[PDB]
Amino acid sequence: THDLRVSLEEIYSGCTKKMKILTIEVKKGWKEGTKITFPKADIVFVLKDKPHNIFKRDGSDVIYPARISLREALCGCTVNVPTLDGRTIPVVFKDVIRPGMRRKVPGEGLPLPKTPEKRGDLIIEFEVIFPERIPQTSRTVLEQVLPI
Amino acid sequence: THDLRVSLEEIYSGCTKKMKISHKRLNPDGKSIRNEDKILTIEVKKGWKEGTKITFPKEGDQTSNNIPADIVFVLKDKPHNIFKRDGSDVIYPARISLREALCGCTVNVPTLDGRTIPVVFKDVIRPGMRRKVPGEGLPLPKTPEKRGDLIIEFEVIFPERIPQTSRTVLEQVLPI
């Protein structure tokens, strides 16, 4: 049993992996756990998602962590979401964003493996960054404008 | 395999549960089968974990000329509306306003034995922040004299909406 470590990009487009023990054809959208047998003692491979530095994979969806300031959360925010093929899409938020809020960007996920012309979604997942400290001056004003 | 649902309070102090079960029994005629109720008594010890198994030998069904089957209870944590169990720790969700998170607040932490412990926060509280209250958890089952911790876990509640005049002001005081 041998682990086959595939990046998100390789799941998205599909690829050829030449293994030096042997050629494996990774079909687009294939999910961690997919087994790829060889007659050559039967050497069986198993598909594993390599960690990605932009997205967390969730089936055929990908999650994009958006770290925004509290100021943006409360007052208005544009997230320029990166795509799997390296463009960005501007998504404009005019309402209050809450900690952990998600927003679907439909069709911007990975191809579904059985129907690869169809894609999952890209899911923005908000992390709201609080200030490290508030000066007394600011505290006073926050007390006037925010609900108890 | 039957579920034995036990409250956090019952795990905290221990308890004696009495479970009414019904089992099948071959009648004296060897033909017909009856259904009868039996009440089994289970002592739940301080700190027992979910998954703990309690076996009542030969207290299950008998539809045959042999020794009746077994009943196995599996301890399950009954959902609690105030705390979440985390091993020997209990987690306490503390829902506070954005105002309290930024400006300071006191959390009156309820305990398993029904006190509150006031805990005062002067610094910014972040979404998801935890604060430990040592020793206010559940008894460690192997050393029931010792206890886990009570953990405060913050949920910060944002305003639904913010008027333009408030936005103008928050833009002046909150860092970019």
Short mmCIF file of all heavy atoms in Angstrom, two decimals, chain A residues 66 68 70 73-74 93 95-103 125-128 130, chain B residues 127 155-161:
data_model
loop_
_atom_site.label_atom_id
_atom_site.label_comp_id
_atom_site.label_asym_id
_atom_site.label_seq_id
_atom_site.Cartn_x
_atom_site.Cartn_y
_atom_site.Cartn_z
N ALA A 66 -11.43 33.89 4.66
CA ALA A 66 -11.28 35.33 4.44
C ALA A 66 -11.09 35.99 5.81
O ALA A 66 -12.02 35.95 6.68
CB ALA A 66 -12.47 35.93 3.77
N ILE A 68 -10.81 39.23 7.78
CA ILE A 68 -11.12 40.65 7.57
C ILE A 68 -11.09 41.38 8.92
O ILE A 68 -11.14 40.75 9.95
CB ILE A 68 -12.51 40.82 6.95
CG1 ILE A 68 -13.62 40.17 7.83
CG2 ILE A 68 -12.56 40.17 5.54
CD1 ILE A 68 -15.05 40.78 7.38
N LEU A 70 -12.47 43.81 12.00
CA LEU A 70 -13.78 44.06 12.58
C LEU A 70 -14.38 45.26 11.87
O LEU A 70 -15.56 45.28 11.59
CB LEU A 70 -13.63 44.29 14.09
CG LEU A 70 -14.90 44.67 14.86
CD1 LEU A 70 -15.96 43.62 14.64
CD2 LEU A 70 -14.50 44.77 16.34
N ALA A 73 -16.05 43.95 8.76
CA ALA A 73 -17.22 43.15 9.14
C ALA A 73 -18.44 44.03 9.43
O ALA A 73 -19.53 43.75 8.95
CB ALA A 73 -16.93 42.26 10.35
N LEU A 74 -18.21 45.11 10.15
CA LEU A 74 -19.29 45.99 10.55
C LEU A 74 -19.63 47.01 9.53
O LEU A 74 -20.79 47.40 9.45
CB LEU A 74 -18.96 46.72 11.88
CG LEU A 74 -18.66 45.77 13.04
CD1 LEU A 74 -18.20 46.56 14.26
CD2 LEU A 74 -19.86 44.92 13.39
N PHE A 93 -19.78 42.93 0.15
CA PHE A 93 -20.67 42.73 1.29
C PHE A 93 -21.03 44.09 1.87
O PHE A 93 -20.13 44.88 2.20
CB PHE A 93 -19.99 41.93 2.39
CG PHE A 93 -19.64 40.55 1.98
CD1 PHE A 93 -18.54 40.32 1.14
CD2 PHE A 93 -20.40 39.47 2.39
CE1 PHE A 93 -18.23 39.05 0.73
CE2 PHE A 93 -20.05 38.16 1.99
CZ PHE A 93 -18.98 37.95 1.17
N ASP A 95 -23.82 44.21 4.21
CA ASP A 95 -24.40 43.93 5.52
C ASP A 95 -23.36 43.42 6.51
O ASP A 95 -22.27 43.01 6.10
CB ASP A 95 -25.51 42.90 5.37
CG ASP A 95 -26.82 43.56 4.87
OD1 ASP A 95 -27.48 44.31 5.65
OD2 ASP A 95 -27.17 43.31 3.71
N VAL A 96 -23.70 43.45 7.80
CA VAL A 96 -22.80 42.98 8.85
C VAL A 96 -22.34 41.57 8.57
O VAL A 96 -23.14 40.69 8.28
CB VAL A 96 -23.46 43.08 10.28
CG1 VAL A 96 -22.62 42.33 11.30
CG2 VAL A 96 -23.66 44.57 10.69
N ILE A 97 -21.02 41.34 8.64
CA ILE A 97 -20.49 40.01 8.50
C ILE A 97 -20.25 39.43 9.88
O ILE A 97 -19.59 40.04 10.72
CB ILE A 97 -19.13 40.04 7.67
CG1 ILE A 97 -19.40 40.47 6.24
CG2 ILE A 97 -18.49 38.63 7.70
CD1 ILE A 97 -18.11 40.81 5.45
N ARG A 98 -20.71 38.20 10.11
CA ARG A 98 -20.52 37.62 11.43
C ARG A 98 -19.33 36.64 11.45
O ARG A 98 -18.97 36.10 10.41
CB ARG A 98 -21.79 36.93 11.92
CG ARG A 98 -23.01 37.84 11.96
CD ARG A 98 -24.29 36.99 12.18
NE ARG A 98 -24.54 36.14 11.02
CZ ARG A 98 -25.03 36.60 9.88
NH1 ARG A 98 -25.36 37.88 9.79
NH2 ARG A 98 -25.19 35.80 8.82
N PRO A 99 -18.71 36.44 12.63
CA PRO A 99 -17.65 35.47 12.81
C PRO A 99 -18.07 34.10 12.28
O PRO A 99 -19.11 33.55 12.68
CB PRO A 99 -17.53 35.41 14.35
CG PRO A 99 -17.83 36.77 14.78
CD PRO A 99 -18.95 37.23 13.85
N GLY A 100 -17.28 33.51 11.39
CA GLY A 100 -17.69 32.20 10.90
C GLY A 100 -18.76 32.22 9.82
O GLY A 100 -19.15 31.18 9.33
N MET A 101 -19.22 33.39 9.41
CA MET A 101 -20.24 33.47 8.32
C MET A 101 -19.61 32.84 7.05
O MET A 101 -18.39 32.96 6.79
CB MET A 101 -20.63 34.92 8.04
CG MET A 101 -21.97 35.10 7.22
SD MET A 101 -22.36 36.77 6.89
CE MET A 101 -21.45 37.06 5.40
N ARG A 102 -20.45 32.17 6.26
CA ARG A 102 -20.04 31.67 4.93
C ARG A 102 -20.83 32.30 3.82
O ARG A 102 -21.99 32.74 4.01
CB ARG A 102 -20.20 30.19 4.86
CG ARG A 102 -19.17 29.46 5.64
CD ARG A 102 -19.50 28.02 5.61
NE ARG A 102 -18.48 27.30 6.31
CZ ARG A 102 -18.18 26.03 6.07
NH1 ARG A 102 -18.85 25.34 5.16
NH2 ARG A 102 -17.20 25.46 6.74
N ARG A 103 -20.22 32.36 2.63
CA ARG A 103 -20.88 32.84 1.45
C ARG A 103 -20.41 31.95 0.28
O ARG A 103 -19.18 31.84 0.01
CB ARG A 103 -20.61 34.32 1.21
CG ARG A 103 -21.00 34.85 -0.17
CD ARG A 103 -22.55 34.90 -0.38
NE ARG A 103 -23.15 35.63 0.72
CZ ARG A 103 -23.30 36.96 0.77
NH1 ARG A 103 -22.91 37.72 -0.25
NH2 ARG A 103 -23.83 37.53 1.86
N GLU A 125 -15.20 31.62 3.93
CA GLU A 125 -15.45 31.45 5.37
C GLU A 125 -14.73 32.54 6.17
O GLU A 125 -13.49 32.58 6.22
CB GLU A 125 -15.07 30.06 5.86
CG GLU A 125 -15.50 29.82 7.30
CD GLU A 125 -15.19 28.43 7.75
OE1 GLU A 125 -14.01 28.03 7.77
OE2 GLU A 125 -16.14 27.72 8.10
N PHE A 126 -15.53 33.44 6.74
CA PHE A 126 -15.02 34.64 7.42
C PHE A 126 -14.38 34.40 8.78
O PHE A 126 -14.91 33.66 9.64
CB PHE A 126 -16.10 35.72 7.51
CG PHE A 126 -16.37 36.38 6.22
CD1 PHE A 126 -17.51 36.02 5.47
CD2 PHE A 126 -15.51 37.37 5.73
CE1 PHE A 126 -17.78 36.63 4.25
CE2 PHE A 126 -15.72 37.97 4.53
CZ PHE A 126 -16.89 37.60 3.73
N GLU A 127 -13.20 34.97 8.95
CA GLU A 127 -12.58 35.10 10.29
C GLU A 127 -12.48 36.59 10.55
O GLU A 127 -11.88 37.30 9.76
CB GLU A 127 -11.20 34.40 10.35
CG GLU A 127 -10.62 34.35 11.81
CD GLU A 127 -9.17 33.91 11.87
OE1 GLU A 127 -8.65 33.46 10.84
OE2 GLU A 127 -8.52 34.05 12.95
N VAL A 128 -13.09 37.09 11.63
CA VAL A 128 -13.11 38.52 11.92
C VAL A 128 -12.04 38.82 12.98
O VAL A 128 -12.03 38.24 14.12
CB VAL A 128 -14.52 39.07 12.30
CG1 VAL A 128 -14.46 40.59 12.61
CG2 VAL A 128 -15.53 38.82 11.08
N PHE A 130 -10.21 40.96 15.49
CA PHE A 130 -10.50 41.98 16.50
C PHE A 130 -9.26 42.86 16.79
O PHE A 130 -8.13 42.35 16.68
CB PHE A 130 -10.98 41.28 17.78
CG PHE A 130 -12.47 41.02 17.79
CD1 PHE A 130 -13.14 40.70 16.60
CD2 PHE A 130 -13.18 41.03 18.99
CE1 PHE A 130 -14.52 40.44 16.59
CE2 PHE A 130 -14.59 40.79 18.97
CZ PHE A 130 -15.24 40.50 17.79
N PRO B 127 -13.72 36.25 19.30
CA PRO B 127 -14.61 35.13 18.96
C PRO B 127 -13.93 33.78 19.14
O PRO B 127 -12.78 33.58 18.69
CB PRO B 127 -14.88 35.38 17.47
CG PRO B 127 -14.81 36.84 17.36
CD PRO B 127 -13.56 37.17 18.16
N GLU B 155 -18.85 33.20 22.50
CA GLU B 155 -19.48 33.50 21.26
C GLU B 155 -19.83 34.97 21.29
O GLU B 155 -20.58 35.42 22.16
CB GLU B 155 -20.70 32.60 21.06
CG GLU B 155 -21.36 32.92 19.72
CD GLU B 155 -22.60 32.13 19.42
OE1 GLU B 155 -23.02 31.27 20.25
OE2 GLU B 155 -23.15 32.38 18.30
N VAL B 156 -19.37 35.73 20.31
CA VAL B 156 -19.60 37.15 20.28
C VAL B 156 -20.72 37.48 19.30
O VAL B 156 -20.67 37.12 18.11
CB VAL B 156 -18.32 37.90 19.90
CG1 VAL B 156 -18.58 39.40 19.80
CG2 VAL B 156 -17.25 37.60 20.96
N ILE B 157 -21.76 38.18 19.80
CA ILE B 157 -22.96 38.38 19.02
C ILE B 157 -22.90 39.75 18.44
O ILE B 157 -22.84 40.72 19.17
CB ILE B 157 -24.28 38.22 19.90
CG1 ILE B 157 -24.26 36.91 20.69
CG2 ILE B 157 -25.53 38.49 19.08
CD1 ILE B 157 -24.04 35.64 19.92
N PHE B 158 -22.89 39.82 17.12
CA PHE B 158 -22.83 41.11 16.39
C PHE B 158 -24.19 41.74 16.31
O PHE B 158 -25.20 41.03 16.37
CB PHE B 158 -22.29 40.85 14.96
CG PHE B 158 -20.76 40.78 14.89
CD1 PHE B 158 -20.04 40.20 15.92
CD2 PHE B 158 -20.08 41.26 13.79
CE1 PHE B 158 -18.64 40.10 15.91
CE2 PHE B 158 -18.63 41.15 13.73
CZ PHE B 158 -17.94 40.60 14.78
N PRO B 159 -24.24 43.07 16.12
CA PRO B 159 -25.52 43.66 15.82
C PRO B 159 -26.04 43.17 14.46
O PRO B 159 -25.26 42.97 13.47
CB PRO B 159 -25.23 45.17 15.67
CG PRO B 159 -23.78 45.38 16.09
CD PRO B 159 -23.12 44.02 16.09
N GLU B 160 -27.37 43.10 14.38
CA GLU B 160 -28.04 42.71 13.17
C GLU B 160 -27.71 43.66 12.04
O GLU B 160 -27.42 43.23 10.93
CB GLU B 160 -29.57 42.66 13.43
CG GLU B 160 -30.36 42.35 12.13
CD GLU B 160 -30.07 40.95 11.58
OE1 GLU B 160 -29.82 39.99 12.35
OE2 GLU B 160 -30.11 40.82 10.34
N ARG B 161 -27.78 44.96 12.33
CA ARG B 161 -27.56 46.05 11.36
C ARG B 161 -26.89 47.19 12.11
O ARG B 161 -26.98 47.27 13.35
CB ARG B 161 -28.88 46.59 10.78
CG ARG B 161 -29.48 45.72 9.66
CD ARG B 161 -30.83 46.26 9.18
NE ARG B 161 -31.75 46.56 10.29
CZ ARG B 161 -32.55 45.68 10.88
NH1 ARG B 161 -32.59 44.38 10.51
NH2 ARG B 161 -33.32 46.11 11.88
#
